[PDB]
């Protein structure tokens, strides 16, 4: 029986009076830790611990005790329960911290590996023991300063486990110089060309910053954002990028994004956007955005990063508009964006990213909005220099046969109009170039006409989000809409029908559009005053029925997700239904429209 033989090694370790004997026993008990743990765990563990408490004068036996404990605890779920047994006595963890003050390799290295495993398996509990132990975090931070690369590198992994989801420890590590030290490890290792140690440092940096407002502030106020610029100085290569270089650069971009996340306190993102402009980071990122031979996944992530760097920041938005591609007719980055978005051939995730970048370029940027719309107006301002305009590309996508391009172009245009009173009115002057035989038709009416043409649902959702955005807060748009006599009957007909579930969303959007045409109706068009439209709802469809159908939009499965996330990074083309900003409009208007409809007078 092994339970007995290991009991004899246990009693030797415990009772044996000479160091040499105890040591050979621990060494053998080690043999039985790998390939045989369970008894060793339940019968050797407290003796191995006793060797750590006594016997500290012999590095060799301590080494073996820790290697054996590592083997009891680590999984390369037995590992979980042995961890719980180990830490029952919290002094067992503080004893490990004491041992980590020793520099002898055979003590230090296994100590680091064991405490890392404990930390990975029972994070919150082990972290708490370390946090309240005097000098506990300090002794671990100092592992980064060990002369031996193997220890320093395993120290980074330990500190990932220590900092994970622990605000208090993250703040201590920041005060103890972690940002400078980790950035310097990355520089020395060669930035994104630096292999797995760089990846590990970047992961630790993410633990230090993600969901940590105080550390993001420390990062910014410590003038560390400028240290991120060299990371994106990639140019000598641009064909044979290793998988590890891609992994590193992806993490580096994610770090940039943490600092300008739309979910931060607004002042934090804004102040970081400014700092990124001042040290040349934004400019450097736009350089990779316009380079050649950048792997698809980096290109997409870089576009999504630049998006958040510019989002709502006038100086940065204006910088982005000044960026040109290196072509014989210089071509704005914005045009290069829109080309890709409506390119039926490009990868879906790239088309989504380019849409995000365009939305963020326009966000709170009335100047940019007016620049886009003005390319659609009969105004011979020298558009040449770049012959294809942003407006021409959006019209092409709007009326192309590809529903994805229809949706993206309609949403891109809605973002050009949103909260812009002037551009909503300007866009009403746009008349489509019609092909031979066809009568003239306004852009507004043509968008509307497409809704009754057997177009795909996706096409019609996009056009309806556009039309709702256009008419919202714009009585003159409402009048131009209502003045074409086909529009109200069409809307009431669509809403009144008893169609399948997928078609219900279109019905709901039709109800929103009809509601907008009541709520924002200035009663200047005798044919369709508010009371006439309301009586029409009652007769053709019924007031309660109207509201049920209006309610379909916000009750849709994908609506909740679109409302929470600004990024349009849908899983696949069939999920491309709702725009985030559009969800804000529905939230703003559904309630007040509902009240307007139920009102009697």
**String of DSSP letters for 285-351:** HHHHHT-SS--HHHHHHHHHHHHHHHTT-HHHHHHHHH-EESSSS-EEHHHHHHHHHT-TTS-HHHH
**Token pair for residue 121?**
């398996």
Measure the CA angle with vertex 342, ends 586 and 365; round to 5°: 50
Method in brief: X-ray
CA 354 to chain centre: 15
499 in Cβ contact with 451 (< 8 Å)? no
What is the C-alpha separation between 309 and 306, in angstroms, rounded? 5
Q: Dihedral of the CA atoms 460, 461, 467, 470 (nearest 10)?
A: -140
Among the listed residues 544, 520, 540, 545, the one whose alpha carbon sits nearest the alpha carbon of residue 530:
520
Place of tokens 């103890």: 176
Helices marked H in 452-557 — which ranges?
457-471, 475-483, 487-496, 501-519, 530-540, 543-555
Residue 332's beta-bridge partner residues? 324
In the structure encoding, which two tokens stand for residue 287, read together?
A: 């350089």
Query: Residues 6 or more apart from 50 whose CB is under 8 A from it?
Result: 13, 14
Q: Distances in Å between the alpha carbon of 38 and those of 85, 303, 309, 570?
A: 12, 52, 53, 47
Name the strand (E) or helix (H) holding 582.
helix 580-598
Annotate 388-436 with three-state secondary structure.
CCHHHHHHHHHCCCCHHHHHHHHHHHHHHHCCCHHHHHHHCCCECCCCC
Residue 420 near residue 366, CB atoms below 8 Å: yes
**Resolution of the coordinates, Å:** 2.0
Token digits for 199?
């990846």
> What Cα–Cα distance (Å) separates residue 108 from each residue in 115, 200, 256, 500?
11, 20, 35, 68
Look at residue 442 and give its three-state secondary structure: strand
Report all structural domains of the chain as residue ranges with CATH numbers, in order of start. 1-601 (1.25.10.10)
Cross-strand pairs, 325:
331
Distance CA(179)–CA(442), nearest Å, equals 57
CA distance 172 to 174: 5
Distance of CA 53 to the CA centre of its chain: 47
Does residue 47 contact residue 8 with C-beta atoms inside 8 Å?
A: no
Chain breaks in the chain (C to N over 2.5 A) after: 76
d(CA 453, CA 304): 35
From the list 398, 293, 407, the residue with the least C-alpha distance to 348 is 407
- How far, in Å, CA of 19 to CA of 176, rounded? 40
Closest alpha carbon to 289 in 336, 339, 255? 336
In angstroms, rounded to a whole number, what is the distance separating the alpha carbons of residues 89 and 110? 20
- Rg of the chain in Å (alpha carbons): 32
Let me know how many helices (H) and strands (E) the chain has, helices first: 35, 2
Query: Which residues partner with 442 through β-bridges?
Result: 431
CA distance 435 to 470: 25
Q: Kindly state the tokens that stand for 387.
A: 């012959």
- From residue 137, alpha-carbon distances to 64, 87, 128, 151, 601 in Å are 25, 17, 11, 16, 70
CA distances from 234 to 197, 273, 287, 382, 400 (A): 19, 22, 9, 36, 37
Q: What is the DSSP string of 147-190?
A: SSHHHHHHHHHHHHHHHTT-HHHHHHHHHTTHHHHHHHHHHHHT
Residue 287: C-alpha distances to residues 110, 237, 283 (Å): 45, 14, 6
Phi/psi of residue 259, nearest 5 degrees: -70, -25
SS3 content of the chain, % helix, strand, coil (to 5): 70, 0, 30
Largest CA distance in the chain: 108
């Amino acid at each position: 029986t092994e339970a007995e033989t290991i009991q004899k090694l246990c009693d030797r370790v415990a009772s044996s009076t000479l160091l040499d004997d105890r040591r050979n026993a621990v060494r053998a008990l080690k043999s039985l830790s790998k390939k045989y743990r369970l008894e060793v765990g339940i019968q050797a563990m407290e003796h191995l611990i006793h060797v750590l408490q006594t016997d500290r004068s012999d590095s060799e036996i301590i080494g073996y005790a820790l290697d054996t404990l590592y083997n009891i605890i680590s999984n390369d779920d037995l590992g979980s329960q042995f961890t719980e047994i180990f830490i029952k006595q919290q002094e067992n963890v503080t004893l490990l911290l004491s041992l980590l003050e020793e520099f002898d390799f055979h003590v230090r290295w296994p100590g680091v590996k064991l405490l890392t495993s404990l930390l990975k398996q029972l994070g919150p509990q082990v972290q708490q023991i370390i946090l309240v132990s005097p000098m506990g975090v300090s002794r671990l931070m100092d592992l980064l300063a060990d002369s031996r690369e193997v220890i320093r590198n395993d120290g980074v992994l330990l500190l990932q486990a220590l900092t994970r989801s622990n605000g208090a420890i993250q703040k201590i590590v920041a005060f103890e110089n972690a940002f400078e030290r980790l950035l310097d490890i990355i520089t020395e290792e060669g930035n994104s060309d630096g292999g797995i140690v760089v990846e590990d440092c970047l992961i630790l940096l993410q633990n230090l910053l993600k969901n940590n407002n105080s550390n993001q502030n420390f990062f910014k106020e410590g003038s560390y954002i400028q240290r991120m610029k060299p990371w994106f100085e990639v140019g000598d290569e641009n064909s044979g990028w290793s998988a590890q270089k891609v992994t590193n650069l992806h993490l580096m971009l994610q770090l940039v994004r943490v600092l300008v996340s739309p979910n931060n306190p607004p002042g934090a993102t804004s102040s970081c956007q400014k700092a990124m402009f001042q040290c040349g980071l934004l400019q450097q990122l736009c350089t990779i955005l316009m380079a050649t031979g950048v792997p698809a996944d980096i290109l997409t992530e870089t576009i999504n990063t630049v998006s958040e760097v510019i989002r709502g920041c006038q100086v940065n938005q204006d910088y982005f508009a000044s960026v040109n591609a290196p072509s014989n007719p210089p071509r704005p980055a914005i045009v290069v964006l829109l080309m890709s978005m409506v390119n039926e051939r490009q990868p879906f995730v790239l088309r989504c990213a380019v849409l995000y970048c365009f939305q963020c370029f326009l966000y709170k940027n009335q100047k940019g909005q007016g620049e886009i719309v003005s390319t659609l107006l009969p105004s011979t301002i020298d558009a040449t220099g770049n012959t294809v305009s942003a407006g021409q590309l959006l019209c092409g996508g709007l009326f192309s046969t590809d529903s994805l391009s229809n949706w993206c172009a309609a949403v891109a245009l809605a973002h050009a109009l949103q909260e812009n009173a002037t551009q909503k009115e300007q866009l009403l002057r746009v008349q489509l170039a019609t092909s031979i035989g066809n009568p003239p038709v306004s852009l507004l009416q043509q968008c509307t006409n497409i809704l009754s043409q057997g177009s795909k649902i996706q096409t019609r959702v996009g056009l309806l989000m556009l039309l709702c955005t256009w008419l919202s807060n714009c009585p003159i748009a409402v009048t131009h809409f209502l003045h074409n006599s086909a529009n109200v009957p069409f809307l009431t007909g669509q809403i009144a029908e008893n169609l399948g579930e997928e078609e219900q969303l279109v019905q709901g959007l039709c109800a929103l559009l009809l509601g907008i045409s009541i709520y924002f109706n200035d009663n200047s068009l005798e044919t369709y005053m508010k009371e006439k439209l309301k009586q029409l709802i009652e007769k053709r469809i019924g007031k309660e029925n109207f509201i049920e159908k209006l309610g379909f939009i916000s009750k849709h499965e994908l609506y909740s997700r679109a409302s929470q996330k600004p990024q349009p990074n849908f899983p696949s083309p069939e999920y491309m239904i709702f725009d985030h900003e559009f969800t804000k409009l529905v939230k703003e208007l559904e309630g007040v429209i509902t009240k307007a409809i139920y009102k009697s007078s």
